Every structure is written in structure tokens, then in C-alpha cells.
DNA sequence: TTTGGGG
DNA sequence: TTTGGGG
């Protein structure tokens, strides 16, 4: 078996071609006629892909794929944009100005789906994987020459989705423009809530960039992968005219609810911008980030400490945002949280000597964790070192000699408790400085 | 390394012992004192386990385990009751009348968590696994002699949870009795809704057997595994006295939200009994099961067709309940849905001959799928064969010659469309009969 | 695999 | 591993 890249496939329906590609869109498998099923997809690869960060996408920068079968069960069900598909025996032809690969599974063509995500669903562990999780033939195995192809496409897919939006603005309609649509349309939104209306009827509360909120019923039997907080792209939805209270989206037998691979820049972006207008301390965010960082995407501790100098994005920037819960604060002695600092030697020192140099700072360490790291036994440190102003206002308390000022000390002691004993978490912006992440432009709201 | 079963471990804190066990309860890791962290667990194994189906549990039928460490990161975070833990160098002593295993991770003891679930979270694929997903040492590998131990304990765990409730009534308080509790208490309920109140603040709408509804905020960073429709056991929750509109549960730094392994009988049971009182066709249930089957647990197509004659429960019973969506209905010709039947020869025949024997029946086949099977390419058939009454009323239409009665035919033709083109699903009770599942006591409500 | 392909 | 263990 020899594979060719999408942009290099020969233009013919005479010689069977094979390839590995990244899926960016897919309908659910559906009956188009009697004894004739179809699954339509949009695919990209290193030789053919979308490069815009925003706005319309160039239709000549991605290719399509139409899979044909005579039974529903022979077609693939694709949940995640960013996953990989391997097709054996496909033809290529031009349709509506695009490279359109075709493949009759009912003849001798086959397909196989490979997971592109490195970590698990909860983002908690590493799942690194040379075998398809879903495939058309009984031939559930891969060849040697394929290994490198799959491994490289995965790496590329992740790098690609983390660098580009991939899904362009013409591939969806803002919800505020939905009621006005003639027929069906696509949606890119964040799932704000999942409500079980019946054992397998999950009502999804959707919200997109336009700030409009819609609801839709998703069949749990088909889409057991959707969960609260995730961003999805709905392929084909129509507006329910008979919706009076809630604005409702209706899905069809060919509609698909597509998630994005974890590295997706578009998803990270949307998870950050979209919030739900809603309405004894437990599991609440304890901080407030300067508004100037409002639309800044969050980075997991996993990416922050293990891929920092390993990405064509992270190694470039110095300011990040992340969320975590504090497992411990050091120094243990809160009185030592505020120290004396010498500008000339950049040396800190206890204030238990009663010095009065005035220049006091904070030098606190937070041992933290988040979902991407809590299952491992590493320690991750985030610093609150203010000799240069970064994080100066975190505690909403001036850096005074805590050996003398008893109130400031107790105030800080409460904060320590607050940061570690109520399932609460920190949302902070940090700046890399000499191999350390220092908190900045972030302050407690408690 | 030699391992001993829980009930056979020597009663001493002198010789270090090692074991593999099934976790049925665990607190989140927490700081109990300065430089001293703890994780408390309840464990069982083939030699020591709970056998009641309902009511109080015998405290001498399970053992406890207390893990000690000097830092948070050295203790395990356990999400799923039913998962397996391997402990190296543990001591055993009697405490409050129970076998209590102890282990100092800060000394030389270690732990390792092994997934007991055969299929993935979505229940969509097979994840069968000889390596821990979480562990205390850098020694992330298992030995040869261990392989059999782990494989056997897994098999046992699943068989155990599918046969017993495991979690007894004394291990939780019904929500209708919660407000009256003195201090903290435990909860076993179904998650009816997950609502994102903040990037990492997920509000859970809980409902238990007592029919009372409570809400609680779960920190997504700690519990990224909870999802709508699943049953959980909350270890340590207190009632929020300051809750006026919603009845709220408050969790602490040591509280844990525990799910159950898929085979859990208790979970299957609760997912079936608990519904939420809520308030253009899409993703709705199309049928109604006779009320006499109201508290009957559902069985996935996966279990129905691949483990049917492979379980110490399924091979015993003949009547099941399951949910699925129809991908195709056969015969293709709806007119052939109703045939003539000869009682003596048990032979069916087309009615296109205009025979008037009166005895007409339905002999329809539904090619179906559900989350446990949609990703595979097998076909699963459920029958609606009424020669013996089973399923006689499914269609709410008498079995008439569809070659003559044009209205009955069209009525059935609409049903075919309804069963296959609106993301809707069937909830039906079936009886195994000669290697086939025939629908019974189920009828369309559309 | 000249089907249907945004159904 | 005589800690603390339902915290």
C-alpha cells in the first residue's frame, strides 16, 4: 500500500489511490436513497489546508471526501474535528472547484479512524495508539510503512489546530443571524449546560461569540461525547419556528455534533470568551484577572511545564493564563511571606531583624495542580515574587513587616486557608521569567 | 514481590505486606496536619466483600486502607468505585473492629491505580491495560506474576459490581433526610444536569431514590469526570443552612465525587429509576414500556449480543430492556410487514395472495445501534415477531392485509420514517427466544 | 469505484 | 511503617 498526500493525488478515477488525512468536518452517516448510504467529509493535510486566522476560508485550501456504502454500519461516525482518517482505494475528481475524493465501501474501499488527542477526555492522563479505534474492514491493523505516516500526521494535526482556527467563518452562522437563515446552517458554540430530559435525550444549552443563547436536543446514543464546557461545531441545524420561549435548534438524521481536538486554538479561544449569565464557600474562582487579559486563552499546567519550550507558539510568548487549585503555600511561616529586598544585590532577607529599608516584597510559592496534572506525582510551582512589581497587588495587602503587623499577618493567614481548604481555584495570568512563572495582573476577590 | 488477599493478610505491623484490591470508597487526598497528608479508603477483594443486595452493610465484610504521605502529590486521587489499587509495603491492624491496612508513602510504601472498566467513557470502544494509569513511584511497570492477579481481580470486580449493590444503605443518607443530619454525610444520586457557572465551577443537579433534588458545586479541576446522566456517590457533604431557593450541598477539601464502574448494578438501577421532572421532532424517545417494567435496568446492545451467554446474570434471565436507534427496517416492502401465519406449521407467508385465514402477524426486523455499538461495523437485529403475542401492540395498528388496506400501510410507512429519520430512539423490553430478542410490552407513543 | 456530493 | 483513621 502506497499513500499520497491530498494535493499530490493524481486527478483520475481510474487508478485507486490511498491516503491519510485530517478530518475537519463530517456529516453523520445517512441514507440518501434505497440501499445507498453516504458520509460527507472535509479533509486537510500538510499539502492542503486552511491558513486564515479569521474570516472566510479559501475553498481550494481543503478537500472533500464522499464515502459510499449500502448499509449504515459501513460508514464512519466521526465525533472530533482533528482526528485522522485512512482511506484505501479512493478516486479523485473535481467538484464545485474542489478536490473531491470518493470511495465505495460497498466495493473494495475501506476507512479507518485514528485518535489524534494525546491525553484522555478529562485531560488527566497520557494515551500515547498505532491502531484505529474504528474501521470498515476486519483488518484492524496497520503496516510498518504506515507508522511514520500516522505519527507525523498526528504531530502535524495538533500543531496545525493550535496555530490556526482551521474552521473558517463561512463554515458556520452566528446564532444572532440564525432565525434569519433560509434553510439549515452550521453552528460553532460552547456547551454551557447539559440537561437530561430522558435517559437518552440530552438538552444542550449553546452560546456562541455573538452572545446569543440557543438550545437543542442531542441524541445521547449518537453523541455520548458532548459535555458541559466544551466547544462544538454543529453540522446542519435548522431554526425551530415553533419555538416561543427558548430559541431552539433542530437536528436531522444527517446532522453531526463535532468536538475539537484538545490543541484547537479556536476551541481554547471560545472556552475563554463565552460565559453564561447566571445567578458556604465551595469550588469558586478566588481571583480576578485584569480585564486587558479577558480574551486571553488558558494554558494547562501540562502545557505550561512540559511543552513550554516545545511549541511553535508557547516558546514564542512569555505571558500566559491558567487555572489551578493550590495544594500548598511556601514559606510555611506566613510571616516569611514578606521579605526585605536589596535592589543592588537582588537579595531577599527575613524581616525578623526589624530592618526599615522600606522596600518590602512578597516571595510566595504556590504548589499547584489542575486536571491535566493532578493524577501525576510531580509538583508544579507558580510564584508570587514581587521585587519587580509583578503580582504586587495579588493579596490586596501592602507588603509590611509581618513580624510586627499582626493584622496583616492574620489577613494573609486567612488567604492561605481560603486558597487551600474550600475546593476553590485560582485563575491567574503569569509571565515566564528565568524559568519560572510569576503571577501578575491578578488579584483575590476574597 | 508476593501478594496476599485482604482476609488472609497476617495481623501485624512488623512484616510488610503487599496486595491488590478493589476500591469502593475514597476521600480526596487532604492535609490533616502540618507536613502530613492522608487518603482514606474502603477496599474489598474475593476474600472480603459486601454481599447484601439492600439494607445495612456488615462492617466486617470490607477492609479499610489509610495512606500517609508528607505531600499532597504522593497520594492517589480515586474517581471510580470499582477501580483497582496495588499497595506495596502495607501494615495491618484492627481499628473499630475492621482490618485496617496502613501504608506510609513517605517511607517506602507505594500505590498504583488500575482501570477496571473494559470500554471507554462513552462506552463506545474497547480499551482492553497492564499498566497503572496513576502511581506513586517512578516504577510505572508491573511484573509477570502480577499480570494474572490483576487480570483476575478485574474480572472479579466487574462480576461483583454487576451482581451486588456493593455500596450499602448505611454508606449514604437519602436526600430527604439530609437537612436533618447533624454533621456531614454521604450521598448516592444521579446527576440530572451539569451547568457551567464558571470555567471550572460546574453546578451539579442531583436527585436520589427519595425523589428529592439538591444542587452542589463541583470543582472541575478536581472532578473532570462527572457528566450528566451518571450516578455518583459523594463522600462527605454538609447541608447548606443558608440555602433558601435551592437545597444545596457543600463539599470540603477532603470530599470526593465517586463514579461507579460500568458494570455496577446499583448505578444501572438508579439510572433507570431517577428522572427529572421537566417541561420539530428530534432526539426523543418514541416508545412506552408497560409500567410493570418501570424499575427494570437497561442492558446495552454490547452486553445483549456479545456477553449474553457470558454472564452470571444475563444467561440466567430472558427478559431485558434496552434503548437504541433504528438504522433500517426489514422487510423493505412495508406491505410485507404483516404476513399470514399457519399455527400448525409455524410458517409465515405473504398476503399478496389475498388469503383470508384471519390470523395475521407482524414479522419486522429493526437493525439497531446504541452508543456501545455504533462505532463498530456489526449489525444488530431486534425482532417484532408477533405469532405468539409478543409485540402485538407495538405499532398501535392491527395486523391487516397491507396489500388491501391502504391506510394501515401508510400509517406504518409513517412509523418507519419516524423510527429512522429524526434522531429519535426506541426504549423497549425484549425477551430472548431461540437466539433472538423479540420486542414485547412496548408501544409507540407517536 | 461517473454514485451523490450541503443530505 | 503505633501516624491518624469520617478528615
Curated annotation (Swiss-Prot), chains A, B:
PANTHER family: PROTECTION OF TELOMERES 1, PROTECTION OF TELOMERES PROTEIN 1
Keyword terms: Chromosome, DNA-binding, Nucleus, Telomere
Compartments (UniProt record): Nucleus; Chromosome, Telomere
Pfam families linked to this entry: POT1, TEBP_OB2-like
InterPro entries recorded: NA-bd_OB-fold, POT1, TEBP-like_OB2, Telomer_end-bd_POT1/Cdc13, Telomere-bd_alpha
Other information: The sequence of the A (or alanine) version is shown. The S (or serine) version differs in only two positions, and the K version in only one. There may be other versions in addition to the S, A, and K versions.
The keyword Nucleus belongs to this UniProt entry's keyword annotation: yes
Function description: May function as protective capping of the single-stranded telomeric overhang. May also participate in telomere length regulation during DNA replication. Binds specifically to the T4G4-containing extension on the 3'strand and protects this region of the telomere from nuclease digestion and chemical modification.
One GO term (biological process): telomere capping
GO MF annotation: an example: telomerase inhibitor activity
Family matches, as Gene3D superfamilies: Nucleic acid-binding proteins (2.40.50.140)
Keyword Nucleus: yes
Name of the molecule in the record: Telomere-binding protein subunit alpha
Similarity-based family: Belongs to the telombin family.
Subunit structure: Heterodimer of an alpha and a beta subunit.
CDD domains in the record: hPOT1_OB1_like
UniProt-listed SMART domains: Telo_bind
Annotated Gene Ontology cellular component terms: nuclear telomere cap complex; protein-containing complex; telomere cap complex
Amino acid at each position: 500500500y502506497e499513500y499520497v498526500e491530498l494535493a499530490k493525488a493524481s486527478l483520475t478515477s481510474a487508478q485507486p489511490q490511498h491516503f491519510y488525512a485530517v478530518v475537519i468536518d463530517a456529516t453523520f452517516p445517512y441514507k440518501t436513497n434505497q440501499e445507498r448510504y453516504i458520509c460527507s467529509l472535509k479533509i486537510v493535510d500538510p499539502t492542503l489546508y486552511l491558513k486564515q486566522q479569521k474570516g472566510a476560508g479559501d475553498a481550494s485550501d481543503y478537500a472533500t471526501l464522499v464515502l459510499y456504502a449500502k448499509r449504515f454500519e459501513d460508514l464512519p461516525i466521526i465525533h472530533r474535528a482533528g482526528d485522522i482518517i485512512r482511506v484505501h482505494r479512493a478516486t479523485l475528481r473535481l467538484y464545485n472547484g474542489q478536490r473531491q475524493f470518493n470511495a465505495n465501501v460497498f466495493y473494495s474501499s475501506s476507512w479507518a479512524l485514528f485518535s489524534t488527542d494525546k491525553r484522555s477526555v478529562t485531560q488527566e492522563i497520557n494515551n500515547q495508539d498505532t491502531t484505529p479505534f474504528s474501521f470498515s474492514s476486519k483488518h484492524a491493523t496497520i503496516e510498518k510503512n504506515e507508522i511514520s505516516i500516522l505519527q507525523n500526521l498526528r504531530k502535524w494535526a495538533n500543531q496545525y489546530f493550535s496555530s490556526y482556527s482551521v474552521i473558517s467563518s463561512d463554515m458556520y452562522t452566528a446564532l444572532n443571524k440564525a432565525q434569519a437563515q433560509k434553510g439549515d446552517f452550521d453552528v460553532v458554540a460552547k456547551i454551557l449546560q447539559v440537561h437530561e430530559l430522558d435517559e437518552y435525550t440530552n438538552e444542550l444549552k449553546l452560546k456562541d461569540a455573538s452572545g446569543q443563547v440557543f438550545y437543542t436536543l442531542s441524541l445521547k446514543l449518537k453523541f455520548p461525547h458532548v459535555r458541559t464546557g466544551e466547544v462544538v461545531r454543529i453540522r446542519s441545524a435548522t431554526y425551530d419556528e415553533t419555538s416561543t420561549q427558548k430559541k431552539v435548534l433542530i437536528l436531522s438524521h444527517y446532522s453531526n455534533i463535532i468536538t475539537f481536538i484538545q490543541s484547537s486554538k479556536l476551541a481554547k479561544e471560545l472556552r475563554a470568551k463565552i460565559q453564561d449569565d447566571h445567578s458556604s464557600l465551595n469550588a469558586v474562582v478566588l481571583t480576578e484577572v485584569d480585564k486587558k487579559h479577558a480574551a486571553l486563552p488558558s494554558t494547562s499546567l501540562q502545557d505550561l511545564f512540559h511543552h513550554a519550550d516545545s511549541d511553535k507558539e508557547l516558546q514564542a510568548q512569555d505571558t500566559f493564563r491558567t487555572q489551578f487549585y493550590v495544594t500548598k503555600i511556601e514559606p510555611s511561616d506566613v510571616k516569611e511571606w514578606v521579605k526585605g529586598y536589596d535592589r543592588k544585590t537582588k537579595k531577599s532577607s527575613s524581616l525578623k531583624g526589624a530592618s526599615g529599608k522600606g522596600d518590602n516584597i512578597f516571595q510566595v510559592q504556590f504548589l499547584v495542580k489542575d486536571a491535566s496534572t493532578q493524577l501525576n506525582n510531580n509538583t508544579y510551582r507558580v510564584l508570587l515574587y514581587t521585587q519587580d512589581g509583578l503580582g504586587a497587588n495579588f493579596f490586596n495587602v501592602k507588603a509590611d513587616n509581618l513580624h510586627k503587623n499582626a493584622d496583616a499577618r492574620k489577613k494573609l493567614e486567612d488567604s492561605a486557608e481560603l486558597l487551600t481548604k474550600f475546593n476553590s481555584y485560582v485563575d491567574a495570568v503569569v509571565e515566564r521569567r528565568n524559568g519560572f512563572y510569576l503571577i501578575k495582573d491578578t488579584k483575590l476577590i476574597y
